[model samples]
Target: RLYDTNKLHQYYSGPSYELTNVSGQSQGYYDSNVLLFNQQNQKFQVFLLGKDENKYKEKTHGLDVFAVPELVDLDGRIFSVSGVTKKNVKSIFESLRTPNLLVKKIDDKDGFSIDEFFFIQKEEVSLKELDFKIRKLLIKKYKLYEGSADKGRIVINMKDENKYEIDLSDKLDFERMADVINSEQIKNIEVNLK
Candidate 1:
């Protein structure tokens, strides 16, 4: 009940579902590099890093996102990552379906779907300044495509239009933080996510 549909695959390496963990890590496998996560995380692990190679490859470090379009800064916004007015993250891997890896939007930008959330390495600093910097960067960075000053909603069209987005939420008004965008620019929009 088999078909030799190939000439020869080096990985003709047996049936690929034996379930084993390498890199001296005590973890079981579901397939290839993906593993069943234990130890209180209550989630499955997706190896965006690599496949079932012998050891944990260096290239697999950090995060990998869906092929969302890149930020071009057409209007000159230096910010590389596009902030979606609405967050619609759909897990990292296309085949993933469990644990609700979906990402939700912070603000309501309308017609925006987020497919990524890159945890950029930033230096630790004050909240007020951070909010201000982000807002100014977004406005001055991209071409002011649409929105109203009263509602404080701005949409900067990116390369593929649907692929990029920036959502400036009500973070401008945190706990007595301040309203930077309200007065001048975002003042106290510190995202407190647990």
Candidate 2:
């Protein structure tokens, strides 16, 4: 009933995912959608969805939703969600980490971090009492240009004073991109543009 990759790897059957982030801490590279479990400190460093100087007002204690890194490849648009209440983001990570998933290497590594597997819910609004919830979501979700009237494409700040450029003219094109960025990591994104 559970997703077992080892079984499928041997018997050639079963769901593609089942890996869990038992460690709860990142073991490899920088995950744009990071969910850190500081067992020693009993704290979590979650990367929302985008880049912001003041990422979080509260050091820890909230839920975050991040855009799936693999959005560029699929015909449909989707993002990954996570919560600290869960002992782990294991369930979701396992499925995403399945090596043979969608033909190995291709799917398993689709989004950003393979460790962020325990996905939570979807898009929502944080109003009134729930405003704090939205603040957490804002920690990393894509950003939009400030101001109204002639609103411009969202601009992301990179490095200390550097920045990155994005194009959303053809939304699908977002997925077509292949790390146009240089050695620097992408810090932010512009989402829900008209």
The candidate scoring highest on lDDT is 2
User: Model 2 over residues 1-194: C-alpha lDDT tens digits?
Assistant: 12332221222111111112223332222555444443332233433333321233334433332222222215332222222221232344343321110101122223321211112222221111111222123222322111111121223343465654333221212222222222123333222232
Ten contiguous residues with the weakest lDDT in model 2: 97-106
lDDT of 1 by residue, 58-154 (tens): 3322221111112223542221111111122343343322211122234444333323222212221222333334344333432121232112332
Q: For every model shown, what is its TM-score relative to the native structure? A: 0.20, 0.19
lDDT score of residue 103 within candidate 1: 24
Question: Relative to the unseen true structure, what is the C-alpha lDDT of residue 179 in candidate 1, on a scale of 0 to 100?
Answer: 10
lDDT (CA) per prediction: 0.25, 0.26
Off by over 4 Å in 2: 1-151, 172-194
Q: Assess the local accuracy of residue 130 in candidate 1 as a C-alpha lDDT between 0 and 100.
A: 35
Worst 10-residue stretch by lDDT in candidate 1? Answer: 5-14
Give me the displacement of residue 146 in model 1, in angstroms. Answer: 7.0
CA shift of 121, model 1, Å: 4.4
